[PDB]
Design a protein around this ligand. Structure first.
Ligand SMILES: *[C@@H]1O[C@H](CO)[C@@H](O[C@@H]2O[C@H](CO)[C@@H](O[C@@H]3O[C@H](CO)[C@@H](O)[C@H](O)[C@@H]3O)[C@H](O)[C@H]2NC(C)=O)[C@H](O)[C@H]1NC(C)=O
Ligand SMILES: *[C@@H]1O[C@H](CO)[C@@H](O)[C@H](O)[C@H]1NC(C)=O
Ligand SMILES: *[C@@H]1O[C@H](CO)[C@@H](O)[C@H](O)[C@H]1NC(C)=O
Ligand SMILES: *[C@@H]1O[C@H](CO)[C@@H](O)[C@H](O)[C@H]1NC(C)=O
Lengths: 413, 413
């Protein structure tokens, strides 16, 4: 452990943490330096696993994960106070929140050139993970899981493949929340999603069927029919550009119906907090670096997407059969809808183990409830979180914790 | 107005109502006596319309409507306290909550034979509505709307037809909330609903398609294929009999995962309240009558369903073109899912007026949001309430009030 990176007194806590936590920089490729925030397991660091958490974007910060999803403490609406999180993932794991790629959040490079792409980011994370274990050698033995959300449906499998090549790293599994596993399935499934969740109506549905579909299959992905395109554009407008919350259809859109924030998302609370000069100091952030933003428009705008589907990577990770994989999805998200990923998993053709069923969670007073549905294969499970959006741990923390706990512990969901 | 039916001091109110309200009995057919509860418009009774509200079941009470949906005051969880409702429908209307048919709630008959059927109940309500105006002649001029929910998708159109025959009654429109308009469309649409809301998965979806569907038109209604039936039974088990809240999919099922209550519904609050001997007294209920239940198992179990579709009744009501009709649906309800009714309306073939679009509601701080979608035809509109279940005014009161206000006032939604 690099002592100088230790986080001493973090502004906004009434009482200091019982666990150690570090914040500093990991070397990536070239002259890139990725900011990390490592929170030790609240229960036996030396025998709790090592979890990498990557938010997606591309261009968005993994400190959103920490501060608004499943970190030990969550920033409150005043931008100043942090409250402990009883459902935090670092209850049972050493969680490494990594701001990536270069330029996102407090991460930078010496040359400041932040145009990048999937292969480069994969390599960058891989090398940063390498640099991590040089700095934290006492965690080289620990079980190592790679987890992410959103565009990290690309970051994570591509990374995992590189990790798979290095047996010094003790990779045991990976989990992806509302991930982007396949643009084609995402896009085709979203359109059904839109109709059957009441956003489209029958004239438009008919048109779509007529122009984009022939008898038992639709192409809403790359269809060249010009009348299909005009309708897909209408769907794109309804879903993404007309007032709905694409991250969570049944939630209000932050700041009425019409720097890069994610859409329908208020990022004030976290930004206010992390730009506090005392917070930057506590987190060993060098002063000269620009303000923190949840996402970087430059990164996102300059980003080159190469992989169109994670089918290879997953089969390549499944062939070995050393690795326990989970894809989970909020079933009211339209950014990466649950069905797209259910189709994606189903189309991996693995040996079915447990048939598709409910899975439960115990609540105070409410008793046991259905948290979602789960379909298991050997080494790979798909699972939904009923009534949760793009950011599962925010919409349903307890369910998210249960899922995660049962994942870490090789247990049935 | 029958003075003796006036409600004087209602237990559980801190301060007494600014409006008059009456509770007593209307004569139906034979020796049947229906309990009513009439709440005068809070704003100019003499020029506010007359709204009949019927809950469905069959066998369930319209006092649920009052006490848990859109009455001037709602019973609170202690079963004792009533709190005023700022979104109450009697803000702008004279709302007549009618317990029907005979045997439901405080309604009875001298002979106590409560087996009945759609045609008899229709006639019974019609005659009770007649008896109403004998008792309340000063309201014969007022605009008269027939509104209901649930199985009242049958009660209301069938009733309306009888009302349509009597020009002494000033019928102006009717509205049905998550109504049962057509068993066939309800049943076929529910199955799609189930799949695309993540309850079914692909093996079961495939089977269903295979056995229940040829060439992309499905029969999930009355299909005789024995392999189809085995799967429809599975669907029935998942949707209705496995822990989900059929009234609202994203809500927990009251009292964990397993007298006729509705399923997944706690009826304690209201029952506790209405069985209070002092409440019965305040509401002029004769003592000898049995306890109040939100639904009557006898009625429901002995009920004979005759109409299989309200297509006739609605065209018959539309032909005249004196009548303004609204079907609205909570888009997370599985008892009477929104699509079934959207299909039902679309298949009425009326002259399209306004194309399908969003409709908005202003919230405190949140600004304008999308409350749902609306598709208007000549004299008949279909409209959804996003994120609302079977009981719209409970899940989304403000949106429900807005909708209703805009309905009453012949205004665009
Ligand atoms: C995704 O980005 C990576 C990293 O930038 C790209 O790989 C890099 O490709 C560039 C040019 O496209 C190479 O630049 C060369 O540098 C070497 C230095 O020895 C020199 O021989 C040339 O003069 C040139 O400047 C760079 O070597 C190369 N890096 C790696 C690790 O392969 C990759 O091509 C991008 N992929 C796509 C599809 O755009
Ligand atoms: C965003 O959050 C900040 C503080 O958390 C608050 O002051 C502001 O009003 C919020 N904006 C919206 C649209 O909720
Ligand atoms: C039903 O409601 C009552 C009164 O609100 C409450 O005390 C009780 O916990 C509820 N019962 C169940 C089984 O949830
Ligand atoms: C419905 O009820 C009425 C009144 O009791 C009765 O005359 C009629 O025969 C019933 N209809 C059917 C189909 O049984």
């Amino acid at each position: 452990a690099p002592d100088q990176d230790e986080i001493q007194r973090l502004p906004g806590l009434a009482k200091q943490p019982s666990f150690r936590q570090y914040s500093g920089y990991l070397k990536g490729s070239g002259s890139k330096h990725l900011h990390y925030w490592f929170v030790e397991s609240q229960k036996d660091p030396e025998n709790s696993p090592v979890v990498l958490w990557l938010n997606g974007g591309p261009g968005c910060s993994s400190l959103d994960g920490l501060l608004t999803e499943h970190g030990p403490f969550l920033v409150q609406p005043d931008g100043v106070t942090l409250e402990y999180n009883p459902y935090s993932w670092n209850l049972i794991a050493n969680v490494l929140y990594l701001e990536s790629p270069a330029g996102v959040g407090f991460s930078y490079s010496d040359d400041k050139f932040y145009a990048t792409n999937d292969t480069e980011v994969a390599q960058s994370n891989f090398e940063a993970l390498q640099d991590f274990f040089r700095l934290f050698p006492e965690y080289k033995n620990n079980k190592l899981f790679l987890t992410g959300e959103s565009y990290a449906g690309i970051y994570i499998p591509t990374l995992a493949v590189l990790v798979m090549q290095d047996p010094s790293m003790n990779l045991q599994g990976l989990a992806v929340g509302n991930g982007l596993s396949s643009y084609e399935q995402n896009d085709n499934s979203l359109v059904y999603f839109a109709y059957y969740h009441g956003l489209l109506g029958n004239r438009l549905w008919s048109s779509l069927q007529t122009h984009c579909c022939s008898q038992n299959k639709c192409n809403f992905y790359d269809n060249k029919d010009l009348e299909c395109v005009t309708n897909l554009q209408e769907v794109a407008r309804i879903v993404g550009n007309s007032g709905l919350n694409i991250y969570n259809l049944y939630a209000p859109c932050a700041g009425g119906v019409p720097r890069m924030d994610p859409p329908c998302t208020n990022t004030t609370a976290a930004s206010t907090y992390l730009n506090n000069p005392y917070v930057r100091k506590a987190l060993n952030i060098p002063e000269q670096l620009p303000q923190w933003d949840m996402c970087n428009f430059l990164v996102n705008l300059q980003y080159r997407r190469l992989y169109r589907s994670m089918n290879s990577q997953y089969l390549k990770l499944l062939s070995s059969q050393k690795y326990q994989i989970l894809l989970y999805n909020g079933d009211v998200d339209m950014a990466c809808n649950f069905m797209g990923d259910e189709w994606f998993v189903d189309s991996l053709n693995q040996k079915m183990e447990v048939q598709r069923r409910p899975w439960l969670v115990k609540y105070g007073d409410s008793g046991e409830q259905i948290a979602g549905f789960v379909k298991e294969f050997s080494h790979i499970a798909f699972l939904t979180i009923k009534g949760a959006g793009h950011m599962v741990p925010t919409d349903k923390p307890l369910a998210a914790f249960t899922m995660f706990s049962r994942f870490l512990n090789k247990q049935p969901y």
